[PDB]
Amino acid sequence: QGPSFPEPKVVRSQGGLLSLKLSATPTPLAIAGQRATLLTYGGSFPGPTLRVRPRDTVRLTLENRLPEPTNLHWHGLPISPKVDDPFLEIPPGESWTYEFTVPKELAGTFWYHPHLHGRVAPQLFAGLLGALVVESSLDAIPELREAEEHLLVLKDLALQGGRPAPHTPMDWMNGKEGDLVLVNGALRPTLVAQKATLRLRLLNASNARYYRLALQDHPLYLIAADGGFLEEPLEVSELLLAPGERAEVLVRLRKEGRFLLQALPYDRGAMGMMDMGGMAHAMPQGPSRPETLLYLIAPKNPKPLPLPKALSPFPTLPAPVVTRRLVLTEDMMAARFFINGQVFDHRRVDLKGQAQTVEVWEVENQGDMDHPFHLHVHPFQVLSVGGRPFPYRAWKDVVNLKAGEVARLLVPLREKGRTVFHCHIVEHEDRGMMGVLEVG
Ligand SMILES: [Cu+2]
Ligand SMILES: [Cu+2]
């Protein structure tokens, strides 16, 4: 009712249970004024938003109707790696039911996508992704309850012949970016705000594109990172979202008008072709061109809410028991990517850690591109990047490292089992940059 805004269909838990059969299938769809056949969950792009409360049971049956094997990664959920199993393969025509309980203190925006090694990048690029929202008691305080809430799934695409464009040799090296920069599967939609305070859940579900988000004439007030709430709102003029990262921001519309949400130029170190330059840039691709993501129309006579004074206190973490060093390196021309000089081998365990202990991980980017590092199953606290302090305390599961940057992460090891860590430029993961952690 009122103005429409494109947003994925929401499926909600009922009486503590979210039970849902989701098919992964090729699907003809309308997209940016054309018809295209994508790979989708539940017949839509993006897939449906699953919305649960803490302590809910999730029983998701994935029915594989693709021509190739697949599986699901529950990105950012601290659940068992025997449920969130990166090594599982669901053959075409077969089904698999994922059953888990939502942890009691969890809150924020998460997502699901394929994680069959070697096929992630084509499958994710083809449209297989969806959001998972864990509601929190904090959503009831007036300063958030009365905000207008929307999910914004940021995902670019490129089509050729009415299907997702194939990966080129350059895509395996740089990660694939597409010419259609979409919001919730729509091109430059318009959001007609009905409240003066907005609460926007942001999800970068792109293969490799970075979104340096800025809203004309407005700061953003960050209230949640990947894995949960900040301790209090943080005002920012702009917000860089790397592939796989999520944020929740409050927007306070002061005046009437139409304001662009843009992805400002960002240079993530991608490499260009043909060596024959004059002066300007050369063969580094250089900064991305700016993109308009959506248009925001403020309500008449807008009066925003006061910001919440506080959000969620961040638990103090015990002293770490071990320090780890993970060096990321690249061989760009072979498009091969390494952690500590090795490529992923599913038969090899790279790190052995103890359940119920805290570790510090020093992840060092000795490449020339940004690499966004992701750890399954165990959310972490970023303490510092490049020797300087992180700007807030919150659970993260992806941390962006620019060339030469070293991140120090506090990693509480929860669930026992074998899981992975990898770059979330998913082409790099497919081409080597993944390793295996075993918790016992
Ligand atoms: Cu992910
Ligand atoms: Cu990478």
C-alpha dihedral, 221 to 227 to 231 to 234, nearest 10°: -20
CB–CB of 224/230 below 8 Å?
Answer: yes
User: Which residue type is seen at 273?
Assistant: M
- The answer to whether the annotation marks 281 as part of a ligand binding site is yes
Residues 2 and 77 in one domain: yes
Q: Measure 205 CA to ligand 1 centroid, in angstroms.
A: 8
Residues 169 and 94 in one domain: no
CB atoms within 10 A of CB 348: 10
Other CB atoms within 10 Å distance of the CB of residue 403: 15
The ligand with the least distance to the CA atom of 245 is 1
Is residue 274 packed enough to be buried (19+ CB in 10 Å), middle (13-18) or exposed (0-12)? exposed
User: Whose atoms come closest to the Cα of 402: which ligand?
Assistant: 2
**55 and 7: one domain?**
yes
The total domain count for the chain is 3
Q: How many whole angstroms from 209 Cα to the centroid of ligand 2?
A: 12
Tokens of 330: 């690249």
Tell how far the Cα of 299 is from the centroid of ligand 1, in angstroms.
35
Q: 73 a known binding residue?
A: yes
Report the C-alpha gap between 117 and 88 in whole angstroms: 10
Which burial class, exposed, middle or buried, applies to 217 when counting CB atoms under 10 A from its CB (0-12, 13-18, 19+)?
exposed
* 358 beta partners: 412
State the Cα–Cα distance between residues 314 and 246, nearest whole angstrom: 18
Q: Tell whether 353 and 259 lie within a shared domain.
A: no
* CA gap 162, 34 in Å, rounded: 8
Task: Give the list of residues 6+ apart from residue 418 with CB closer than 8 angstroms, or none.
Answer: 81, 87, 349, 436, 437, 438, 439
Instruction: Say if CB 415 and CB 437 are below 8 A apart.
Output: no
Which of 292, 312, 332 terminates a domain? The answer is: 312
Distance 15 CA to ligand 1 centre (A): 28
Is 263 found in the same domain as 141? yes
Q: What number of other Cβ atoms are within 10 A of residue 156's Cβ? A: 21
User: What stretches of 150-223 show up as alpha helix (H) in DSSP?
Assistant: 169-174
Is 150 among the annotated ligand-binding positions?
Answer: no
Give me ligand 2 centre to Cα 162, in Å: 29
The C-alpha angle with vertex 362 and arms to 358 and 363, in degrees rounded to 5, equals 125
C-alpha distances in Å from residue 46, one per residue of 102, 140, 251, 267: 22, 27, 24, 27
> Rounded to whole angstroms, how far apart are CA atoms 440 and 436?
13
Check if the beta carbon of residue 231 is closer than 8 Å to that of residue 178. Answer: no
**Shortest-distance ligand to the CA of residue 173:** 2
d(CA 73, ligand 1 centre) in Å:
7
Please tell me whether residues 127 and 2 are part of one structural domain: yes
Distance 67 CA to ligand 2 centre (A): 27
Rounded alpha-carbon distances, angstroms, from residue 139 to 18, 107, 133, 172, 234: 20, 10, 12, 41, 17
Expressed in angstroms and rounded, the spacing between residue 57 Cα and the centre of ligand 1 is 21
Instruction: State the ligand closest to the CA atom of 423.
Output: 2
Ligand 2 centre and the CA of 195: distance in Å? Answer: 39
On whether the CB atoms of residues 178 and 156 are closer than 8 A, the answer is yes
Are residues 103 and 114 both part of a single domain?
yes
Which amino acid, 387?
G
Choose one of 135, 164, 187: the last residue of a domain: 135
Q: Which of 283, 377, 363 is nearest to 83 (CA)?
A: 377
* Nearest ligand, CA 367: 2
Question: Is the distance from CB of 41 to CB of 47 less than 8 angstroms?
Answer: yes
Would you give the distance in Å from CA 136 to the centre of its chain? 20
Question: What gap in Å lies between CA 125 and CA 177, rounded to an integer?
Answer: 9
390 class by beta-carbon count within 10 Å (0-12 exposed, 13-18 middle, 19+ buried): middle
Could you tell me the distance, in angstroms and rounded to a whole number, from the CA of residue 428 to the centre of ligand 2?
A: 5
Whether residue 367 contacts residue 384, with contact meaning beta carbons closer than 8 Å, is answered with no
| 242 and 203 within one domain | yes
The ligand minimizing its distance to the Cα of 76 is 1
Distances (CA, A) of 332 to 35, 68, 363: 35, 28, 20
Q: Are 435 and 350 in contact (CB under 8 A)?
A: yes
Beta strands 130-134 and 95-101, pairing class: unpaired
Rounded to the nearest angstrom, the distance between the alpha carbon of 324 and the centre of ligand 1 is 22
Residue that finishes a domain, picked among 280, 312, 344 = 312
Rounded to the nearest angstrom, the distance between the alpha carbon of 341 and the centre of ligand 2 is 14
Which string of DSSP letters, residue by residue, matches 152-165? EEEEEE-EETTEEP
Here the tokens at position 410 are 């506090």
Q: Note the ligand closest to the C-alpha atom of 427.
A: 2
Contacts of 15 (CB under 8 A, 6+ apart): none
On whether 117 is known to bind a ligand per the annotation, the reply is no
Q: How far apart are the first and last CA of the chain?
A: 52
Q: Which two tokens stand for residue 246?
A: 């999520």
Domain with 345 in it: 313-440
Q: Write down how long the chain is.
A: 440
Please say whether the beta carbons of 8 and 92 come within 8 A: no
**Distance, CA 328 to ligand 2 centroid (Å)?**
8
> 290 and 141 in one domain?
yes
Peptide bond connecting 46 to the previous residue in cis, omega within 30 degrees of 0? yes
282 contact partners, CB below 8 Å, separation of at least 6: 272, 275
How far, in Å, is the centroid of ligand 2 from the Cα of 178? 17
For the chain, the maximum distance between any two Cα atoms, rounded to a whole number of angstroms, is 66
| Beta strand ranges found along 253-350 (DSSP E) | 258-264, 291-297, 322-331, 336-339
Query: How far is the C-alpha of 202 from the C-alpha of 24, rounded, in Å?
Result: 24
- Known binder of ligand: residue 218? no
CA dist., res. 412 & res. 401, Å (int):
20
| Pair 277, 148 in one domain | yes
- How many angstroms from the chain centroid is the CA of residue 233? 21
Least distant ligand from the CA of 430: 2
Resolution (A): 1.7
Burial class (CB in 10 A: 0-12, 13-18, 19+), 311: buried
Q: Which residue has the tokens 């700007």?
A: 391
Enter the tokens of residue 349. 């365990």
331 Cα to the center of ligand 2, angstroms: 11
Does one domain contain both 105 and 226? Answer: no
Give the number of the ligand closest to the Cα of residue 420.
1
- Across the beta sheet with 130-134, the strand order is 10-12, 49-52, 130-134, 108-113, 73-75
Q: Are 437 and 420 in contact (CB under 8 A)?
A: yes
Task: Name the method of structure determination.
Answer: X-ray
CA distance 380 to 315: 12
Name which of 238, 248, 184, 249 is nearest 210 in CA terms.
238
| 210 class by beta-carbon count within 10 Å (0-12 exposed, 13-18 middle, 19+ buried) | buried
Task: Name every residue whose Cβ is closer than 8 Å to that of residue 379 and which is 6 or more positions away in sequence.
Answer: 76, 78, 226, 227, 228, 395, 396, 397, 412
Distance 424 CA to ligand 2 centre (A): 6
Pair 88, 18 in one domain: yes
Do the Cβ atoms of 207 and 425 come closer than 8 Å? yes
Joined tokens for residue 215: 């809203």
Is residue 346 part of an annotated ligand binding site? Answer: no
In sequence order, what are the beta bridge partners of 101?
A: 57
